[PDB]
């Protein structure tokens, strides 16, 4: 998932953009993936209960 | 040394500073040649003498004057009056003749 | 060299069901035994595709290009040869040309001044245009070629790319599934709004052989594609049917 | 050692009895590799730069460049092209940047008029022969052509437009031979008083100065349109590295992993492979049509079994999901 | 603000090369003459 | 051949356009860190409360 960024590939984002904006795009990717992982963990906790 | 720019490389391959010999007849009179279109030559039957060294300095002063007004139009590519052209070359010989 | 033909037997436009034709590979990515969903220009299933008949039927009209065209032909003896592409279809604007002779294919994008009735005529008489002023690109490749030959083509124009997908199948439109593989990519970068087929006429005046072709238009929609173990598409479903 | 690695993860100096998972095992990367298809279909720079004859400045020619790869490094590598002043783009990035079309403009002028070939400049060549726009994305190449464009009797084949009623527009050619109207009296087609031919022929000779020797000028104009950029620079190919943790660039895709032999049967048109995870697990090399399984550098979870440090110090290491003939 | 140490770097470049003086910016002077770090605090002054 | 002098000289001329005019660039770097600051901005101190 792009998570609002221009690309879903992290290294492609590094390569195709300048680091000043690639860093913002990668921050968006990282926060999206952390959100996905915490959603998975929360659902797993409820199911485990 | 005095500030005038060095002459172009075209002068070397176009100016004959030594007598050609018996087979070829060349004018030995000291003459500076401003052919135009950025071409400048001096016809020299130079010998190893003090006068020829002063004559050379006198004649480069003619040609060195020529590159100065190269930017001006062809009809205006001359001295302001008849006396300036020779006078500017004479101070070159006067300075070169100093001990 | 242009000759207008008035032996046409006028007939109202025909129609037939598309069934499940027009599926092509949307990209060049390998997938094995997975169901993948994609959104791209596709021919809707069971659509109303136009029917054109060649026999004295002489169907060489000019059709809009729209967002894309699905060209299919029930063919034998290779009566169909190529197509014309452009917007104003004259020397005013740049036009695209596809022809396939007995030797190879010729692709040219020039300011052609096409004949009002372009056609081809053994075949040694090519009469399809009158002039060529500014040629900006030319390409040459191998030839593309009872009713025994089914030829299906897809033409698209996105981001200045002219994609062509083809599939040859030996056999109305038959019932079955056959994905269309990409054939050639053209980096031309022009606009196309109309087209016209080029037909080969048999001279022994002229007589038209037994052949037919169909023109269907692509629409943006989502298909669910099923890949086999070897990586080819074997079935699909239209999510808006 | 793994015991300290456990302390590092727990952020503590004492470890209770139990099993703890700390970090993972991926054979680290090592090199960087780039691969591109064979460099063919070079742009015909030789047909323009090494042309037998260059046209006059007023009849300055057009040679459009497209559907080819342009090697600007080779043309710059030539020693005689001493003059290289480039506008609007760094010469170094011309080897990489791509444009829709490239216009090669060739003519012959004097050495003194070389400075007139620049945006925002004026002159007889600038106003009457070739005008260059201020927002010019491209640049020129000029070199001495005395050995080729000069004759002892004079090479009069080159002409320049001395007079014109108005200054030329950018990228505009004027080849009109109409007699210039210098006075109010009509010319009537007669080059008489106040009426002269606008074009004058250069009398190039090998016995002129540096500023009057002929200089062949090749002008490169670069444009980017909505049409695809079909003029690219050459791409460097690095030798293939296999069975090692490397960073790869295959036709523009970046990634990191080990490149191994693949038994998959790609279709002839297909190039990339994706698993059920929608990740690029396989790729086709451009130099040789072979499939390389982009196995992620042998990665695996790790876990340390340890008694309490209050009891002992020995530890045991567990690599789950790994047959340890591979460690 | 209060700084610990301040450094002044001065040179002369062409008109169209001023945009190449920027963090993470590529170019001839950027790659071969003067490159600024990405995590760079501080800033540049240019005048005719 | 293939051996060139990497140093090229700017031949600045007043007749050149704005793209080739000489520009003087001064780069300022600040060491904003935890070290005891030495470069002080214009401020006035106050008694310690
Ligand atoms: C003249 O002087 C200039 C500058 O020192 C130099 O570049 C040039 O080569 C010289 N020419 C001759 C003929 O000495
Ligand atoms: C896939 O290819 C194999 C040959 O490698 C063939 O035996 C098999 O029939 C193919 N699968 C299908 C569905 O055709």
UniProtKB/Swiss-Prot annotation, chain B:
Q: What is the effect of changing residue 73 to D?
A: Increases very slightly the interaction with RBD domain of SARS-CoV-2 spike protein
According to the UniProt record, what happens if one changes residue 39 to A?
Strongly inhibits interaction with SARS-CoV spike glycoprotein
Q: In which tissues is it expressed?
A: Expressed in endothelial cells from small and large arteries, and in arterial smooth muscle cells (at protein level). Expressed in enterocytes of the small intestine, Leydig cells and Sertoli cells (at protein level). Expressed in the renal proximal tubule and the small intestine (at protein level). Expressed in heart, kidney, testis, and gastrointestinal system (at protein level). In lung, expressed at low levels in some alveolar type 2 cells, the expression seems to be individual-specific (at protein level). Expressed in nasal epithelial cells (at protein level).
Q: How is it used?
A: An engeneered stable, dimeric and secreted receptor with combined mutations that increase the affinity for human coronavirus SARS-CoV-2 spike protein shows potent SARS-CoV and SARS-CoV-2 neutralization in vitro.
Mutating residue 70 to L: what's the consequence?
Increases slightly the interaction with RBD domain of SARS-CoV-2 spike protein. In sACE2.v2.2; increases interaction with RBD domain of SARS-CoV-2 spike protein
Interaction with SARS-CoV spike glycoprotein, as annotated region: 37-41
Q: What is the effect of changing residue 73 to A?
A: Slightly inhibits interaction with SARS-CoV spike glycoprotein
Binding residue positions for substrate: 29-30
Disulfide-bond pairs as recorded: 28-45
Name the active site residues.
Answer: 59 (proton acceptor)
Question: Could you list the residue ranges forming a coiled coil in this record?
Answer: none
Result when mutating residue 8 to P: Increases slightly the interaction with RBD domain of SARS-CoV-2 spike protein
Induction per UniProt is: Up-regulated in failing heart. Expression is induced by IFNA and IFNG. Exposure to cigarette smoke increases expression in lungs. Expression is decreased in nasal and bronchial epithelium of individuals with allergy after allergen challenge. IL13 stimulation decreases expression in nasal and bronchial epithelium.
| Post-translation changes | Proteolytic cleavage by ADAM17 generates a secreted form. Also cleaved by serine proteases: TMPRSS2, TMPRSS11D and HPN/TMPRSS1.
Highest taxon of the lineage = Eukaryota
Instruction: Please state where this protein is localized.
Output: Cell membrane; Cytoplasm; Cell projection, Cilium; Apical cell membrane
Q: Which residues bind Zn(2+)?
A: 58, 62, 86
Protein family: Belongs to the peptidase M2 family.
How would you summarize the oligomeric state and partners of this protein?
Homodimer. Interacts with the catalytically active form of TMPRSS2. Interacts with SLC6A19; this interaction is essential for expression and function of SLC6A19 in intestine. Interacts with ITGA5:ITGB1. Interacts (via PDZ-binding motif) with NHERF1 (via PDZ domains); the interaction may enhance ACE2 membrane residence. (Microbial infection) Interacts with SARS coronavirus/SARS-CoV spike protein.
**The protein, known as:** Angiotensin-converting enzyme 2
UniProtKB/Swiss-Prot annotation, chain C:
Domain BetaCoV S1-NTD: where?
Answer: 1-241
Disulphide bond pairs = 2-115, 110-135
Effect upon mutating residue 126 to L: In strain: A23.1, Omicron/BA.2.75
Q: What is the effect of changing residue 13 to S?
A: In strain: Gamma/P.1
Q: What is the effect of changing residue 151 to S?
A: In strain: Gamma/P.1
Annotated consequence of substituting residue 7 to N: In strain: Gamma/P.1
The highest taxon in the source lineage is Viruses
Q: What is the effect of changing residue 100 to Q?
A: Partial loss of biliverdin affinity
Q: Which residues are glycosylated?
A: 4, 48, 101, 134, 191, 230
Outcome of residue 151 to K? Answer: Partial loss of biliverdin affinity
Mutating residue 59 to A has which effect? In strain: Beta/B.1.351
Q: Specify the effect of residue 205 to S.
A: In strain: Omicron/BA.2.75
Name the segments for region: Putative superantigen. Answer: 228-241
Q: What is the effect of changing residue 5 to F?
A: In strain: Beta/B.1.351, Gamma/P.1, 19B/501Y
The record lists the effect of residue 6 to I as: In strain: Omicron/BQ.1.1, Omicron/XBB.1.5, Omicron/EG.5.1
Q: Describe the protein's quaternary organization and the partners it interacts with.
A: Binds to host ACE2. RBD also interacts with the N-linked glycan on 'Asn-90' of ACE2. Cleavage of S generates a polybasic C-terminal sequence on S1 that binds to host Neuropilin-1 (NRP1) and Neuropilin-2 (NRP2) receptors. Interacts with host integrin alpha-5/beta-1 (ITGA5:ITGB1) and with ACE2 in complex with integrin alpha-5/beta-1 (ITGA5:ITGB1). May interact via cytoplasmic c-terminus with M protein. May interact (via N-terminus) with host bilirubin and biliverdin, thereby preventing antibody binding to the SARS-CoV-2 spike NTD via an allosteric mechanism.
Biological function: Attaches the virion to the cell membrane by interacting with host receptor, initiating the infection. The major receptor is host ACE2. When S2/S2' has been cleaved, binding to the receptor triggers direct fusion at the cell membrane. When S2/S2' has not been cleaved, binding to the receptor results in internalization of the virus by endocytosis using host TFRC and GRM2 and leading to fusion of the virion membrane with the host endosomal membrane. Alternatively, may use NRP1/NRP2 and integrin as entry receptors.
Q: This protein is called what?
A: Spike protein S1
Q: Which organism is it from?
A: Severe acute respiratory syndrome coronavirus 2
Source gene?
Answer: S
Q: Which residues of the full protein are shown?
A: 14 to 293 of 1273
